């Protein structure tokens, strides 16, 4: 064979060039940095009203409005200051794993096993919330809807591919292929020109939203990657897998930066998020808890101990004043 | 109170939304959630049609004042089982496999690993599983084709229709690793009338009664 040999030798030489030039891991340089102590975060508000397993949650751009998706087919918009339910949206599909807040606060796009991203308009003229546009074209379950603009959103699926849409037309503008497993999560960059997606093939990769190239690939996990999110400066990202490990990769180094695993940790990470400064890497785990790792030292510098079930979703306000954690115990808790 | 004239109306709207949420959750908790599972080419488009009537396929029907929601599996193509944990707390699992399953070629490996997967999952081990063998048009004409040594070397004895069915049910009982909590409901009928719906209704009635008894501490 020739092409298989060519691919193997290209992979080997890229890996050799990557190793021979890499100086030292993130910990080797950042060990001199003092720790942050223990992040003791207390539940200031508990949001009640969801009557099923809570799977998704996304903060508003004003750091006061929240959207939460539960199993009973409910997408609730909360006022995070007074626990006032601003809105309650009965979803068409009760099996939702993701949904987000539009950056202008006008729309919410949400979906799951239906393979359809349904987008509802909030600032209407009739005082209710109506379905604006349903994006279809995926052949597998949906994940990590993330608005780019009011007419443009990227969604991941289990088709080993991601899609960039155009809401007015409703047609799939761009398709990013190259994964070899169920893609579980994507995060949008702060500059809204690149993104990353991690799949069940224990690999993540950085994709260009404009021209649709497979810009970079990233491996190092042993099992399915369930969550992913950028560093707030859009030059790095973190994944959480079923290997009971979080891994920080860098978008310019082309391999793993460092790892956030512990011996006592046996269950996988299902949600991941960053604080506003990119110092506290918060991970909602499978057992019961949320661990506040120091994204520089990989130390368990805080545990959010509520949530009698598994913490399924995390969120940080755009101002960073609070952390929303949602679990299968049918409750969000807002922590500060 | 300290609330302004507008925040009082906002609180009133939020309380009305609370009222609607609990009112609809009362109906949502009074609905029977059934998962539907099966191996490749096992047959799922023949029992959902018997019910009283893309990604996930939802079938809704009311039987004897019970609202059943059934969630199908034939709309997915990825078998990574990342969506099974979404089906925790369902009433029961209707799993479908046919006696003619070793025609597409072997019935042991893929089907029995699917069973052991749903019998090993932490989320499903406390949920009862319903087993169906419905039709009676081809389950007899391929037993007498040849001795099963070609793909079933575990048994080398007498083989009639009833004996083979009983042996398959017994080996299924052997597949169940823990009978302390989960209960298997196998069914051997004719796919001719609405007996499958009555059987699943009785199975869910019994499992709900047993959950009630465990909740009361009587079981």
């Amino acid at each position: 064979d020739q092409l298989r040999q060519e691919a193997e030798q290209l992979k080997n030489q890229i890996r050799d060039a990557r190793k021979a030039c890499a100086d030292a891991t993130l910990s080797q340089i950042t060990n001199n940095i003092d720790p942050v102590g223990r992040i003791q975060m207390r539940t200031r508000r508990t949001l009640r009203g969801h009557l099923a397993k809570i799977y998704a949650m996304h903060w508003g751009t004003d750091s006061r409005l929240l959207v939460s998706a539960s199993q009973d087919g409910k997408l609730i918009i909360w006022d995070s200051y007074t626990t006032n339910k601003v809105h309650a949206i009965p979803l068409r599909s009760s099996w939702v794993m993701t949904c987000a807040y539009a950056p202008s606060g006008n729309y919410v796009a949400c979906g799951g096993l239906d393979n359809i991203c349904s987008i509802y308009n909030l600032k209407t003229r009739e005082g209710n919330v109506r379905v604006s546009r349903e994006l279809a074209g995926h052949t597998g379950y949906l994940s990590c809807c993330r608005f780019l603009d009011d007419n443009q959103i990227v969604t991941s699926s289990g088709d080993t591919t991601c899609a960039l849409w155009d809401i007015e037309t409703g047609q799939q503008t761009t398709t990013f292929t190259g994964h070899t497993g169920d893609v579980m999560s994507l995060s949008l960059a702060p500059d809204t020109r690149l993104f990353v997606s991690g799949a069940c093939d224990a690999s993540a990769k950085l994709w260009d939203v404009r021209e649709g190239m497979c810009r970079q690939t990233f491996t190092g996990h042993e099992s399915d990657i369930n969550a992913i999110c950028f560093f707030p400066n859009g030059n790095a990202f973190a994944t959480g897998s079923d290997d009971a490990t979080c891994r920080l990769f860098d978008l310019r180094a082309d391999q793993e930066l460092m790892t956030y695993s512990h011996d006592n940790i046996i269950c996988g990470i299902t949600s991941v998020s960053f604080s506003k400064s990119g110092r506290l890497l918060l991970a909602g785990y499978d057992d019961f808890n949320c661990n506040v790792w120091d994204a520089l030292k990989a130390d368990r510098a805080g545990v959010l101990a509520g949530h009698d079930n598994r913490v399924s979703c995390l969120g940080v306000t755009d101002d960073g004043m609070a952390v929303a954690t949602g679990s299968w115990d049918s409750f969000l808790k807002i922590w500060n | 109170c300290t609330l302004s004239a507008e925040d009082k109306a906002a609180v009133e709207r939020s309380k009305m939304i609370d009222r609607n949420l609990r009112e609809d959750g009362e109906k949502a908790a009074r609905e029977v959630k059934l998962l539907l599972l099966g191996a490749g080419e096992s047959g799922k488009s023949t029992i959902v049609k018997q019910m009283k009537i893309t990604g996930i396929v939802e079938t809704h029907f009311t039987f004897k004042d019970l609202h059943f929601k059934m969630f199908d599996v034939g709309g997915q193509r990825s078998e990574r089982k990342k969506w099974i944990h979404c089906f925790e707390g369902v009433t029961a699992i209707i799993f479908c496999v046919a006696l003619s399953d070793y025609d597409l070629v072997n019935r042991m490996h893929e089907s029995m690993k699917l069973f052991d997967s749903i019998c090993n999952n932490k989320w499903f081990t406390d949920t009862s599983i319903i087993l169906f063998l419905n039709k009676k048009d081809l389950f007899e004409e391929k037993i007498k084709k040849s001795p099963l040594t070609i793909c079933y070397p575990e048994y080398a004895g007498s083989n009639t229709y009833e004996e083979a069915a009983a042996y398959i049910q017994c080996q299924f009982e052997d597949l169940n690793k823990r009978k302390d909590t989960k209960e298997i409901y196998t069914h051997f009928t004719c796919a001719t009338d609405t007996k499958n719906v009555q059987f699943v209704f009785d199975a869910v009635t019994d499992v709900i009664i047993k959950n009630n008894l465990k909740d009361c501490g009587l079981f």
Partner: single-chain antibody
Amino acid sequence: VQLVESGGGLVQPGGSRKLSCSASGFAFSSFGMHWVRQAPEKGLEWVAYISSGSGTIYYADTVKGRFTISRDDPKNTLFLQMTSLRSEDTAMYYCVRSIYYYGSSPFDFWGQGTTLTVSSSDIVMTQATSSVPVTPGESVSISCRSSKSLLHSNGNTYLYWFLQRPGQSPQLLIYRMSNLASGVPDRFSGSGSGTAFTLTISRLEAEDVGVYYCMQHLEYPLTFGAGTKLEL
């Protein structure tokens, strides 16, 4: 969105009347409803309010105990029943919708109004002028003052700026302090502090003339201003 009123006419003193408000074009069951009145060539005056679901009902202390409010959400109708009418009940009656949550516009739409004729503590809002001549293209600043500070502890300022064109019904221009309405040109703006509030208009247009009103919500009963009429 269309609110239409009916039930007006001429009535003898001591009689009882009923006004009906029918809505079509929005979610009536999710909107609280206000009944407002305007005395002939004198000014606006709030009359009554009913919350969503008929939970909270408020009346104006001037005619408190004499009027009553009824509501039908499944039929989308708002009723105002009047028991005994003096020589003051003659007025032009308006029906207003009001939804209340974080960030809403609770006075956006007004009704068409109906005429009623009869045969023969509270916050006070002060409006500086009543007739101002001006030509198009000139920026106009209107000012009005309040008794107490509209600034609540939340940070919200409960001031509503409405415009009434001649022959038309009032329309919201600003709902809390400086927040533009839906479908209104973006040349209007509002600013001020505490008790002194100004509405500024840049690049004045021909159809912008009319009577401007500033009202406080903040509390009950709701009170309107005198009314500043722009001349041209």
